[PDB]
Amino acid sequence: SMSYTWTGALITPCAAEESKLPINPLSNSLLRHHNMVYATTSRSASLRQKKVTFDRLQVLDDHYRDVLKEMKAKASTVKAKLLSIEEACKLTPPHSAKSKFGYGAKDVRNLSSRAVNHIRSVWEDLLEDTETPIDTTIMAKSEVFCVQRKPARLIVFPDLGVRVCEKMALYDVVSTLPQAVMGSSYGFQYSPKQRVEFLVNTWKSKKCPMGFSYDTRCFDSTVTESDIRVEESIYQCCDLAPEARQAIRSLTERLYIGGPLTNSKGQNCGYRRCRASGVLTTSCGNTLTCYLKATAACRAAKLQDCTMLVNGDDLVVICESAGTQEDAAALRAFTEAMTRYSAPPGDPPQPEYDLELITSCSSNVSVAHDASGKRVYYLTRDPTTPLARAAWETARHTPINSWLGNIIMYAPTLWARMILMTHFFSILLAQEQLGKALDCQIYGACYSIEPLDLPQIIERLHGLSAFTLHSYSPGEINRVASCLRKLGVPPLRTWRHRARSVRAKLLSQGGRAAICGRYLFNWAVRTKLKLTPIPAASQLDLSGWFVAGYSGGDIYHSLSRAR
Fold this sequence. Notes:
Blueprint: E1 4-6, H1 25-30, E2 37-39, H2 45-52, H3 62-75, H4 85-90, H5 105-109, H6 113-128, E3 136-140, E4 144-146, E5 154-157, H7 160-182, H8 192-205, E6 209-214, H9 219-222, H10 225-235, H11 242-256, E7 259-262, E8 268-272, H12 282-301, E9 304-311, E10 314-320, H13 324-340, E11 363-369, E12 375-381, H14 384-395, H15 402-410, H16 414-430, E13 438-442, E14 445-449, H17 454-462, H18 474-487, H19 492-509, H20 511-520, H21 535-539
Parallel strand pairs: 3-7
Antiparallel strand pairs: 1-8, 2-4, 3-5, 6-10, 7-8, 9-10, 11-12, 13-14
């Protein structure tokens, strides 16, 4: 069936859309080539629509059925809880899209009578009606990139009341089931230092390793109605409350497998028969689907001793080499199997024999040295998109601060330390906002984080070595320096000067600012301050941070205030 059908009504914006980086002194201090930075808008939606619309022709085989049964046997160990309306309301981000039924996210969080009554009505309707398709809105996503243009991605999501119901039925399932089923291959269970450790140990565990990333083209569009029912069959192996079982059954047929698309103006836009990006099961469902197809495809291809790492549609496989020619042929066979399963490739995969040459979640393992000169592995990435987005976030207030998520996840990197920490600490210190909580996203869930708490967060996620790395690889330094020239970002020497300046000011303030000056900017001086474990680090409650993925799932993981 066709992934989408369209009526001809346009994908419309709900307000004016900005596509150009503003010319602003603060952003210009970071990046001078403002014309290279753009944001996608609804104006390119038609180009995306063409790319994502195609027929799927899936063929399943014994390897696929075998792997599915293995996955279901592990899912059969799970007991999932139904969340109460209160619990589910507390997981709603404060800025989540309002309902068309007369209330918004703040009303949901406050347990307002109108919100709760409506949510209860939507729940009862899921229990009673197993068929009526649930409406969804389709919008063009606004994302920032550097030129060399990408057309906007399309997001599809149901009303706020439905989203709260999805949490009640499935939040515990999508939080617990993926690890139970996929074990160590489930990527979202790892903090950054744990992900590096898994990749390095997996690589070194092979006698003669070979690895590869597999890029599926337009993954969400490749997901079939069969795939979404197979995913449901895995969820149904959990012990579930009867109302949760019915809600899952109803949501599967009424929302997850497909449904009508309405634009921002209320016009009937088309019909979807593939994965919606903006529902609670997207991350878990995609991960399970990718894992199932790939695990089966590895068997078809006769790849030996595979170990996969999967996060949504992002897949990396590390196996035992059978020799160069044998590996090349096996990878072609793997791709052929994936294609039969409706997961055709974007870039054809290539075998790699160096761990550093593999890219997963757009990141690669690199090496630096700590204060003692000992090797430390850490994950880095090309900093182009992070810097372009940081520039946009400097000129405009945005709902998610990618820069803060990037400092958290990429803290050990040369570019996050020299450029992102320096730039934002400088501006926030001047504005007396070092302690103002900002929203950021980690594995798709939203968190409200005060930049002054960064040192202890970094220590937990990466280790104290994140504050001492030096002697970065020549390859990594070259990629950063090349990026800076391309984007017109000032050279590293300028960043060192700015860092010494903000470091002095932070130290002068005492308190949490001084801990930031000491730990975050020790790299900027020769006269190192002593770094010890931060007392606050051991008390940090990071429960919930690296448990599961929730991208598109409308999840907020910070604490709800008492009423």
